[PDB]
Amino acid sequence: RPITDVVFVGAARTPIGSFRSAFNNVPVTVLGREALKGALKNANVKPSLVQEAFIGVVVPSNAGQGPARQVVLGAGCDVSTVVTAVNKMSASGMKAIACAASILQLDLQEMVVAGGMESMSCVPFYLPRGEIPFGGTKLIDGIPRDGLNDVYNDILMGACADKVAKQFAITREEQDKYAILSYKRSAAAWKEGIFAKEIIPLEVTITVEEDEEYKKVNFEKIPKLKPAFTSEGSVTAANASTLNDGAAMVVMTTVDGAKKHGLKPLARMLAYGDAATHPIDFGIAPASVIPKVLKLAGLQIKDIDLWEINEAFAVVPLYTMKTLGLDESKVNIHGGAVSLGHPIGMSGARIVGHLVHTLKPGQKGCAAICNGGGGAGGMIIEKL
Amino acid sequence: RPITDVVFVGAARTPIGSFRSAFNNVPVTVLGREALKGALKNANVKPSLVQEAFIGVVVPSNAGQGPARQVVLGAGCDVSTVVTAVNKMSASGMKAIACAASILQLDLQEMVVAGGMESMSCVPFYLPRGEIPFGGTKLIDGIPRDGLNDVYNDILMGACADKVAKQFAITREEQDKYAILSYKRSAAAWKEGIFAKEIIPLEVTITVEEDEEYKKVNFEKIPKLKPAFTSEGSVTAANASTLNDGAAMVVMTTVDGAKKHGLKPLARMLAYGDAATHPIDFGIAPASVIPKVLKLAGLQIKDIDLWEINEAFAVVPLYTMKTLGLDESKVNIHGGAVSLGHPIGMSGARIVGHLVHTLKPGQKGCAAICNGGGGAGGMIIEKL
Amino acid sequence: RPITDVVFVGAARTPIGSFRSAFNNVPVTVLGREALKGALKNANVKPSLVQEAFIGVVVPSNAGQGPARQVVLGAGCDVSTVVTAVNKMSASGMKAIACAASILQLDLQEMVVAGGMESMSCVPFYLPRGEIPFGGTKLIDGIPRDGLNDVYNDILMGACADKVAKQFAITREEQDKYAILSYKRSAAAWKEGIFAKEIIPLEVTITVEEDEEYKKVNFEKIPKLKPAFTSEGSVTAANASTLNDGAAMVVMTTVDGAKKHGLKPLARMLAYGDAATHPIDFGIAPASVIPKVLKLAGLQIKDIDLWEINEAFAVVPLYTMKTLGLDESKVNIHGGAVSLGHPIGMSGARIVGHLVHTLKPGQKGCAAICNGGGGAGGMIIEKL
Amino acid sequence: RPITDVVFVGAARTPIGSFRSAFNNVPVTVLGREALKGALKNANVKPSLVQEAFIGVVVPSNAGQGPARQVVLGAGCDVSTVVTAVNKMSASGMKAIACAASILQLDLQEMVVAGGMESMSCVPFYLPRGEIPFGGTKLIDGIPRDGLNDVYNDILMGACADKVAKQFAITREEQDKYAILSYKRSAAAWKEGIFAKEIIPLEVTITVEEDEEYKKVNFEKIPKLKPAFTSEGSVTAANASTLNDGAAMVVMTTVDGAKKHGLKPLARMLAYGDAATHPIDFGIAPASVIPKVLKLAGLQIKDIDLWEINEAFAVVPLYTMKTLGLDESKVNIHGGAVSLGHPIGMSGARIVGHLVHTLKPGQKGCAAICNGGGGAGGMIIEKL
Numbered sequence A, B, C, D: 001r002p003i004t005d006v007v008f009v010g011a012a013r014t015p016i017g018s019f020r021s022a023f024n025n026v027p028v029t030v031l032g033r034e035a036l037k038g039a040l041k042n043a044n045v046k047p048s049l050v051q052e053a054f055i056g057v058v059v060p061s062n063a064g065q066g067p068a069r070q071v072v073l074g075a076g077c078d079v080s081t082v083v084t085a086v087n088k089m090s091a092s093g094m095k096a097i098a099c100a101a102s103i104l105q106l107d108l109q110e111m112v113v114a115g116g117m118e119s120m121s122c123v124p125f126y127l128p129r130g131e132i133p134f135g136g137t138k139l140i141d142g143i144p145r146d147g148l149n150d151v152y153n154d155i156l157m158g159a160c161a162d163k164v165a166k167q168f169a170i171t172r173e174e175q176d177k178y179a180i181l182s183y184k185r186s187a188a189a190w191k192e193g194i195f196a197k198e199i200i201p202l203e204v205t206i207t208v209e210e211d212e213e214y215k216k217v218n219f220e221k222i223p224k225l226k227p228a229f230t231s232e233g234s235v236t237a238a239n240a241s242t243l244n245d246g247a248a249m250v251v252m253t254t255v256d257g258a259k260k261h262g263l264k265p266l267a268r269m270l271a272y273g274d275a276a277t278h279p280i281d282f283g284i285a286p287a288s289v290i291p292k293v294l295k296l297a298g299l300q301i302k303d304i305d306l307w308e309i310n311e312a313f314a315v316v317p318l319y320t321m322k323t324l325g326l327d328e329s330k331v332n333i334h335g336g337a338v339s340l341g342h343p344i345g346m347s348g349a350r351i352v353g354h355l356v357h358t359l360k361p362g363q364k365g366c367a368a369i370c371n372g373g374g375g376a377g378g379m380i381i382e383k384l
């Protein structure tokens, strides 16, 4: 099969909750379950048709055995469904979609689901096994420990971004200008109904139906903030992604599978892949994966109508756009992780699902998402 | 490409350590690093040639950001290497190999490594985020919580095995006879040098060069033990797999990649896949995945020379053999997880690597490994 | 020396804070320090004159080394001051005063301070030393563990009170009537300025100057509440004492010491002592200690103008009054622990200090306070 | 009464166990129970005659409600018995005896028990109440937190001793010579049967009948050790007291009570008291309390036949002896806390009970014990 036989037939996501707020105490598996129910409904695919699932999640500690399996069975899929979880840090939700696409192209399955999820609010603290040391010991926070602290450099992802920003003269002022644009774009998109196709609401009693993060902004305060990660840094709490909860899922099949069940293909796969570099330099990895997947698709930069370059920090889209010569009016046009937030296992799936829904038929979209350890995932789709 | 273009060029593993013993306080990332270095040496592949890695690991809590990445960089691979972790419970090490095979068949990479790892000794305890409730709360053990307790039935994997055993009249005595055979087969294999090709030793100061579990047996005591999981049960500490630490890796390429680099293919891929059923019934899933992968390879039961059916409990090989009509003299002939131990992320890779080394040229081997949540992975290879 | 040579020259207390409210995160040592500064100021005694201190505190875990010493040095006393802490559960603050009185009567010191303190809000959770058990373990709440759970019966103090209430036909209705009277008396006393002599305020920024608990009442809801401790119980959250934070201190000397420093004796000691019975029956112990200290003072029930019978539960003053034939109009006339709250190490000192301030000159007051394990302290003073 | 009317009629103690060794996991209340039963048996006093108890214990966290009460009821005393715990750090066991003596002299009771206890092995770790902070927090060790760290200087008691040693030229070599003498004196006393009168054994299954610490010595290694507390320090693990478990109790009455019950007085009280100085200087406090209690008894240094100056560190007896001009052949003649160990709540009672048994009729003994926060207790008795 050619890669273009792989089609997306549905996509949905939860709202993104703010840290310890809307989805406080809501396990990641609940979020994933509701996103998957939503995606299957969007696809008009009954859960019993799903043969296999790949779900990204980075720090599922204390969510119980096989949280990806919990999601799939919770969404009503049959126990015959095959399920795997993947962790590629913030690329997890995209890599899950890639793995699903690979088994479809090899005709190993016909109907598959994929996506990503994270509850950063529910990440626990750790105590090591064995003898508690005389004199006491640290209760370890799983978020920096397994999520956000670089092992090799022993500094947070944001401090890595400070390094890249200084090296490439990406100023505090440019980062704040970009952050403001992201917040304003997120608000405009919500007002225009842009997310209506892709959002499913949750009851928690309250009903959560809107992204929580993007109203949490004070434009006048942004240039006044102190550096958040290093003493002479440029990255701040306003121009960095936030800690968040959410899930995003897609339903994928082959052209034959769609015909067989009378489904409407929403988009098709053109290319996917990954690139990596030094851990501290994850911020430049999207600029390497993008040419790689363009080449796989037989396309050039001018052929992409919309870019989703995950806003890990304002630093990353800024580096990527300037280094590759991208038009900012075609990049992250409905906001991104700086203003919508960043449940790390979710975001890679969210930005792909967003392109599936928001591209006009015929248009091509490219998503690129950097990840801890120095990587980035890339993916190109064509709207149908 | 055809699946038969996918070839294994190397395989290696650490010894398996017993719980809180040989590899006590040794992070999973150290174990995986040494297994990966060993596999690359076995393949005569310089680490700089590795383009992508998939590594299985089930409960990596508190091992730091991106433990699979830590392994790959620790082993000397270039920062350009693409890395993903996978969790399919005890099938993780096998599913990783499958994912690697898929991208090789699609010509998305040429040189890939895959495997699995677990340090059960280093799994931590959890405390949830937020208010410790008045009256106190439970400090949670990550091993049952994220590893071994079934979410849906709220019983341990061994209690699930008790259920399957009683349903299908797999007696305590049959389970004990199988357990004794496994311990004896493990000791005989060690004495005969069977594992010399696949083992790499580790310095921990001690040198660990031998599987620690298989000498921890008293044959006369085995029929005297009480049930380990349920009051009227048949599963015991002796006829159940143990808790362990270890890692296993393989190096994979295409027939063209092997030619290009002057490498000797050891084995080729014939088929891989997965099946699943009700979570409590994971023990019967290997009996479903085996016919599935036989059909994918165009083979019958008689065409397989060696079976590796992971010994999660003696129950599982016994059910599988009697349901499919397998010859026990061709099943788990050098022992298995009851006597060698079961680092859950490792075992699916171990049993495939074992077939790569121990099959005679021209022979075909089938590996099947059940997993929490109701699944099993399957794989068939042919020795060259 | 006769006991009547022992005189009180000052007394002060903090407001009582509600659980995890006004004094949340304020260590017990801060509360004790401010109460002791206040008492010394009330006495017109410079801190350098204090020779010895006894301070009651029941659960000082994690308050650091020698919290009683911390209080004394924090209040400005010289390092030459001798300091001891005592724990007699809820009798601690009274027993501390008794011990101080004993060394004054023996002329072993001339100027001493005594009192009680507790921060129930700051009591920690416990994890035992050594190997954390496989499968997890309980994080133990210090409040029930070291404060409120009876060791012998393995039930809470309130469940003990249910037992005594049922045995002596002290009804739910009588307990609620008493609880209402306590809340109304507390409010009336605050409005009338009754506590103005004895209270010192604290800055925490906010200024805490009033008892927090006594406004936390809904009179209409009281008869509607469910039992709080046992399924068919009579004790409820409204008619039981609450969990609270506070400290109370007194300054004591001999008649000669007062003359020497030109101090005004506020009251003199007539008798003190203790009685005890079966742990579950602590509620009847005040009725035994009262005749004991009356006999020591050469007095009868009619000779006491005011009674302070600590309101551990409404059960306890009710039992005591009816069994001894006391006039309720002379008992706990300005409220008590049901409505003002009950920092367990404090209350014994509070009720004595209250009598020191609120008796008219010439009048005699008797304080009696039951305690976990089956005890009660008693004390009689004469206002001067 | 005169102080000389107060008589000791019995004394006993557990062996002292080494940290996490003989009495590992044995609650302090068990140790105190057995010591109290033993003392009552030594006195030939039936437990039902005991009217009141004072028991010292410094860090009873997680030992349950009212551990002193648990000891008294566990020993078979009547529920009518009045019970109080006291904490004066390492003076607790002595101050308890003082408090008992005071109420006997005032004729408030006739038959009283007193002593001290500690299980340092069972001291727990602490987690504060409320939100675990983002980023994690310290699991606190109760031993330094509530036992051994000075609050004001934020250094351990051993670091305070380093300060006193350097200020007064008490050399490493002098401290080591004293430590060696203590270990040798302890071994000689054990061999000579010195402790046979005062020890009661315990079943834990093992029988513990001997002090565990004094054989844990290597004389040749002592001068080779590194400082234990400060980089340029003189205090080492060998010349400092150790962490230990144990309990010691006495039975006390008046000359009239002894006559009434046909008991033999063993010793009489001559004086008791306390002194204090700056917290870091607790090591010089015994040199202040000794002249104080000598004056109270109308005695001089030459009138004392045996000194028990608690060996918190070798520093403390050395300072005391040279400052007061004491004859070392009369000081700690059967070893002390450096070689026998130092359960902090126990030791003040142990050294007084030891004098009760080991003094010859007509001899006078003085005990002095320093304590955290800057204090020392002192006591003088006369053997009958």
Ligand SMILES: CCC(=O)SCCNC(=O)CCNC(=O)[C@H](O)C(C)(C)COP(=O)(O)OP(=O)(O)OC[C@H]1O[C@@H](n2cnc3c(N)ncnc32)[C@H](O)[C@@H]1OP(=O)(O)O
Pocket: A090, A148, A157, A158, A216, A217, A218, A219, A221, A222, A225, A228, A236, A237, A238, A240, A241, A242, A243, A282, A312, A313, A342, A344, A370, A371, A372, A373
């Ligand atoms: C490797 C590939 C990747 O994807 S890396 C990305 C992974 N994710 C991350 O690294 C998450 C990084 N983010 C964080 O760690 C947190 O959000 C950080 C930066 C630490 C901020 O947390 P925290 O300090 O708790 O936030 P805060 O809300 O209290 O803000 C601090 C001060 O800044 C202000 N602030 C914040 N946002 C805005 C805004 N949009 N507009 C105006 N002001 C803002 C807050 O008001 C606050 O101010 P103040 O100090 O209280 O006065």
Ligand SMILES: CCC(=O)SCCNC(=O)CCNC(=O)[C@H](O)C(C)(C)COP(=O)(O)OP(=O)(O)OC[C@H]1O[C@@H](n2cnc3c(N)ncnc32)[C@H](O)[C@@H]1OP(=O)(O)O
Pocket: B090, B148, B157, B158, B216, B217, B218, B219, B221, B222, B225, B228, B236, B237, B238, B240, B241, B242, B243, B282, B312, B313, B342, B344, B370, B371, B372, B373
């Ligand atoms: C879903 C797909 C899957 O892969 S499921 C499988 C995943 N893994 C698991 O589920 C791990 C299951 N195993 C376990 O949980 C533990 O190994 C269990 C069964 C609990 C045993 O742990 P534990 O009780 O600590 O072991 P233990 O060594 O103290 O043994 C208990 C008593 O039995 C004995 N015993 C043990 N093994 C043998 C043997 N081979 N021969 C003779 N005797 C044996 C021990 O001597 C011990 O005896 P005793 O009670 O001390 O007298």
Ligand SMILES: CCC(=O)SCCNC(=O)CCNC(=O)[C@H](O)C(C)(C)COP(=O)(O)OP(=O)(O)OC[C@H]1O[C@@H](n2cnc3c(N)ncnc32)[C@H](O)[C@@H]1OP(=O)(O)O
Pocket: C090, C148, C157, C158, C216, C217, C218, C219, C221, C222, C225, C228, C236, C237, C238, C240, C241, C242, C243, C282, C312, C313, C342, C344, C370, C371, C372, C373
């Ligand atoms: C041995 C000698 C001694 O001194 S023994 C005494 C030592 N101290 C103790 O034993 C403390 C005993 N008290 C306690 O343990 C707690 O205060 C108990 C009883 C458990 C209550 O705690 P908690 O359940 O958290 O309180 P809550 O405020 O949520 O109340 C529960 C429901 O009752 C109500 N309530 C309470 N007080 C009143 C009142 N004064 N008037 C009207 N209603 C009241 C609350 O509104 C609450 O109602 P709801 O269930 O939320 O609808």
Ligand SMILES: CCC(=O)SCCNC(=O)CCNC(=O)[C@H](O)C(C)(C)COP(=O)(O)OP(=O)(O)OC[C@H]1O[C@@H](n2cnc3c(N)ncnc32)[C@H](O)[C@@H]1OP(=O)(O)O
Pocket: D090, D148, D157, D158, D216, D217, D218, D219, D221, D222, D225, D228, D236, D237, D238, D240, D241, D242, D243, D282, D312, D313, D342, D344, D370, D371, D372, D373
């Ligand atoms: C304020 C009034 C007071 O009463 S203050 C006193 C209160 N109590 C205290 O302060 C307790 C002070 N003691 C302690 O904290 C511990 O005992 C300290 C000093 C920290 C020692 O603990 P730890 O380091 O675990 O001991 P350790 O047995 O491992 O010994 C360390 C090395 O020294 C050696 N050592 C020890 N004792 C002896 C001896 N008697 N003869 C010869 N050698 C000795 C050990 O062999 C050990 O050597 P190595 O480093 O393993 O080679």
